[PDB]
C-alpha cells in the first residue's frame, strides 16, 4: 500500500497528539481521587474500569500518525502490567511526561540521541536510589496497607489479602474469581500450582490476559506424547456427552493434534487445553500420579496397564476449576480423594527422612510444601456483574502489589519516592549539555505522578508539589485527606518494584520516541 | 491494463521526485547524530528503526511514476544490505547524489549513455583506490572500534563483539538473539557442535539436565542404520575394558542395537548416547569423517570397507566429554590431534574449491567454521520490545561490519575515504567531453556521505567538507565531538568492503536511472 | 561599521558566550544571535555564492574583513568603503527585535470579516 511520509515537526506534533489522547484517557484514573473510564467492549455490556492498562489497551485512533504514537505508548502500559500489577497508570503518566518535556527540548535544537542517553543515565541512578531507599516489607500490617492502597483505599481487600497470605503463607498460591454473592469470602482448598503453562496460545480463550479458565475441566493424566486425538477420540466423544472441557496434561502434543483441536473445539463441541507434564522423567510421572490422587484420576500409560484408547471418565482426573497461563497452571479445587491426599502427604514426608540426600530432601520438601499449602481463593462480593469486574480487577491489583511488596518491599507512596530520588540526583551530569538537559528532563518528569494525583483531587497541583519538595524524607501528601505527614505512618505504601518497573519502562520507550524525525504509514484512503 | 506513458522531463522529473522521497526518509538516519524512523507495522507496535535498508523496504508511493523512482533506489539499498550488512544508508545517499547530478547534466543535453560510462570508469578507479588505501584490520582493538562505530558508538557492543570473536576465533559462528534481562549476555555452545540429536528420552542419563552427557566417551561412528548388538560385541569388550561410555552417531536412531544399548545404560554396564548422522549421502559421509579425525577416529561403517568389529582405538573416536540433545550434538575436545584437525580442514578447503553448488558450499563452510571453534550467542538485553528490535538491529549491523573489516580491512571512516579517493582521481578523463562530465559527476557525489553526516549534526556541510578536503590522509571531521583529527586514531573505522560495496551498487543503479527517456505504468485506476 | 553585514555577524560571533537563566532564555538568545547572520547570507545568496563558506570565512577573518558582493573579492570593507552608518545597523536590529517581541507576546487578533 502507498505510504504517507512525514518529517520533523509534522511527525513529532502528530505523535505527541496521539500520545496525549491516550495518556489523558489513562491518567484520569490515577490515585485515590481518580475516577472510572467506560470501555465499550462490543460483546455486550460496557465495562467500567479504573485499571489504566485496560484503558490504554483499548485506545486506537483514526489518524494513522496519531494512532502510531498511541500504539507506541500503549506498549509501556502492557510492559508495566507484565512486570507487576500496579504501575500501569503511573508508567503511562511518566512516559507522557518525558515525551512532552523531551520534545520541547528537541525543539530547542538539541541532539535527540544525547537527550535519550541523558534520560537513561538519570533513570539508572534513580533506580539505584529507589533500591537503597526501599524498606523491606514483611510485617503483615504493612502487607495489609500495601494491599489496601493498591485496592483504592479498600480496607476489606487489604484485610483479605493479608489474611490469605498468612493462611497459605507468603509463598502460597492465591486466586481470585467471581464470587457467588454479595459478601467477600476467603477459603483454603485442595489445589496445586505447577510451573507449566499452555502448550499453545490458541488455548487462550475466555480471558484476554493470555490465560484460560475452565469450569469442571477433565484431566487426562498421561505421561505420553499425543500424536493425534484419534488416540483418544472416543474419550473426546465421552467428553462431548459430558459437555465439559478436557485438560491434557501430557509429555507432548503434536501440532497435528493441536490443529485438530483448532478444527474441533471452539469450531465444534468443547474447549480443550494441553499442558506439559510438569518436571521430567520419574518426577513427571510422580507429579501426574500426585495429581491423579488430587483429582481422583489415574495415570494413563501402559506402565500402569492403561491406554489413551481406554481411559474412562473416571481414569481422567476431575478438577472443579483450573487456571492455565503462559507459564503456570493452578488446579484450584480437585475433587480428589481427601484421605488418600493426606496419606500421600505422610508418605512423601517419610521419603524426606529416607531420601535424605540434599537435593532429594529439597525436591521432596518442595512437593510436601506444595501439597500442604493447597490454594486460597478470594470470592469477590458484588451485587452486579459490572461491579464484579470492577471489584475483581481492584483485588487482583492488590494481590499483585502485595507479592511485589513482599519481594522488594515498599517506598513512600503517592509519588514521594520519585521526587525524593529526583532531589538526590540534582547533581548528576552527563558528558555534554545535551545529556545534561536530558537528565533534567528525566528528573523533572518524575514530579509528574504526584502532580497528576493531586490534580485528580482538584487540589492546586503546583502548591502541593512545591511543599512536598520542601519536605524531607517520608514527608508527603495524603490525597484522601488533604494532610501533609509521614506517609509511612499513614500507610501510603508503594512496592519499590512497581515504581522501579514503571520508571524503567516509561523512560525506555520515551527516550526512543523523541529521537524520531520521520514516520512511514499507509495513506488512509 | 491501459498504460500511462511519459517522456523526457515529464518522466525524469517525476522519477527524481520519487527517488528524493525515499532518500530523504533514509538520509535522516545517517551517522552519529542520525535519528530514528518510525515504520508502521499495522498488526503490531510500530518499528522504531535506524537501519536505513529497513526504512527503504517500506517506502512505496501513491503516484505510479514517483513509485518507480522509489522502487529502483530501494533496489540499491537492499543489494547493499545483501553484500554487507552495514552501509545501506551510505549507498542510498550516494545513489541520490549521482542521480541528481546526472539528471542535471542530462538537462544540459549531455548524452546520458556517455555519462553512464564516465560514472562507471570513475567508480572502477575508485574501487582500486580503496583497495590501495585499505590497511589490514587484525588487532582485537580495531575490531572493537569497527563494532563500536557500526553499533552507533555503542562502546559496550563493540567490546562484546570483539571478545566474542576472540573466544570463538575469527572463523567461529556468532549469532544474536533476544535476551531477557536488561543486561546483554554472551554464551558459547562449547566444542564440536553438529546438528543431530537423540529421538527418545531414555538416553538421558542426566534427567535434571534434560540432555545426554557422557564423560570420556568413545564414539562409534557407524554412518548406517545399525541393526544389532552382535556386530558390537568386540567393540563392547574394548569399551567395557576402558570403562568409558559410547556415543552412537548412527545414520538414523534405529535398530535393536541401540535398544539393547539403552538396556545396558539402565543396567549401568555402559552408558550410551545415540543420534542421527547429520546431512545425507556424501556430505553426511564427510561430516562423519570430519568428526572421526577430530575425535581421532575413523568412520566405522562397511561402506568405507570396515565392519564395526574392525575398529581400532584409532577408528573409534573419543572426546573428553560429549553432549547430545533432542536436535543437536556437541563434542568437547575430541582426542584427534590438532595437526590432524588442521590437515582435515585443508582437505575440506580442497573440497570447497571442488564444490560448485550451494547445497555443498554453505555446508562445507559450516563444517570448517565448527571445526575452527564453537558458536557464540549474543543475548541482547533491553527493557522494552522496541529496544529489543532497535538494539538488535544495531548489534547485527556491528556484527556484519566487524566480519567485513576482518576480511577486507578498514579505511578512515566518516566518509573521508570517499573524499580522499575522489581527490586522487581528479586527473581521470574519458574518451569524450560527455564522458568527462560523467566522471566529474561521480567524483562530486563522493562528497555526499560526508556532507550528509555533517548536516544531521546541524553544521555547515560545505564548510566541514572544504576543511576535510584541505587535509591529507586520515584527517577528517569527528561528528560525535565536532573536532577534526586523524580519523584512524579516533578509531572511526569503516570496513573497506561496505564502503566499496555501497559505492558500486549506488553507481550501477544510478547510472541506469539517468538514461531514462520514457516510463510506462498502469493508469491510476 | 563594516557594511556588508560584516558588523552583525562579527558581533554575533563575539557574543556566542552569552547565556541566560534558563533553557527558554537560552533558546531566545540563540535565536537572536543566529538571525544576525541572516543579512550577510542573504546578500551572498543573491550573488548565488555559497553563503555558508563566505559566512565562515568572514567569521574566521578579523575586524572589517568581508565579502565584496559587487566584485566577489574578499577584503577590508573600509578600504573598499562598504560603510553602513552605525545607526542603520543598530536601528535595524533594535526595531527588528521589537516587532519580534511584540509578535511572540501577541495573544489575540481582531479583524473584520
Ligand atoms: N490516600 C492516598 N494518598 C496519596 N496517594 C495515594 C493514596 N492512595 C493511592 N495513592 C497513590 O496512587 C497511585 C495508585 O493509583 P493507581 O491508579 O493504582 O496507579 P497505578 O495504576 O499506577 O498503580 C500510587 O502512586 C499511590 O501511592
Ligand atoms: N564519530 C563519528 N564521526 C564521524 N562519522 C561517523 C562517526 N561514527 C560513525 N560515522 C559515520 O557514519 C556513517 C553512516 O553510518 P550508518 O549510520 O551505519 O549508515 P550506513 O547504514 O551507511 O552504515 C559511516 O560512514 C560512519 O563512518
Ligand atoms: N559591494 C557590496 N558588497 C557587499 N555588500 C554591500 C555592497 N554594497 C552595499 N552592500 C550592503 O548591502 C546591504 C543591503 O543593501 P540594500 O538592500 O540596498 O540597503 P538596505 O538593506 O538598507 O535597503 C547594506 O547593508 C550594504 O552595506
Ligand atoms: F493504575 Be494501576 F493499574 F494501579
Ligand atoms: F544504516 Be546502516 F545499515 F549502518
Ligand atoms: K488507575
Ligand atoms: K542509517
Ligand atoms: Mg494501583
Ligand atoms: Mg553502520
Author numbering:
A (entry chain A), B (entry chain B): 2 to 526
C (entry chain N): 412 to 524
From the paper:
A 3.4 Å cryoEM map of GroEL-ADP·BeF3-Rubisco was reconstructed from 202,582 particles. The map displayed an asymmetric ring and a symmetric ring. We observed density for Rubisco in the asymmetric ring only, contacting four GroEL subunits. The apical domains of the remaining three GroEL subunits were less well resolved and they extended upward, adopting a conformation reminiscent of the GroES- bound state. The conformation of the four substrate-contacting GroEL subunits resembled the Rs1 conformation previously reported for GroEL-ATP. The four Rs1 GroEL subunits shared the equatorial-to-apical domain salt bridge, R58-E209, not observed in our previous study of GroEL-ATP. GroEL subunits 2, 5, and 7 adopted the GroES-bound state. This GroEL subunit conformation has only previously been observed in structures of GroEL-GroES, never in the absence of GroES. ADP bound in the asymmetric ring showed additional density that we attributed to the ATP γ-phosphate analogue, BeF3. In our cryoEM map of GroEL-ADP·BeF3-Rubisco, the C-terminal tails of all seven asymmetric ring subunits contacted non-native Rubisco. Our cryoEM structure of GroEL-ADP· BeF3-Rubisco reveals how some GroEL subunits can recruit GroES while others are bound to non-native substrate, preventing its escape.
pmcChaperonins prevent protein aggregation and promote correct folding through ATP-driven cycles of binding, encapsulation, and release of substrate proteins. GroEL subunits assemble into a tetradecameric complex composed of two back-to-back rings that surround a central cavity. Each GroEL monomer is divided into three domains: the nucleotide-binding equatorial domain, the apical domain that binds GroES and substrate, and an intermediate hinge domain. GroEL binds to non-native proteins through two apical domain helices (helices H and I) that form a hydrophobic collar around the entrance of each GroEL cavity.
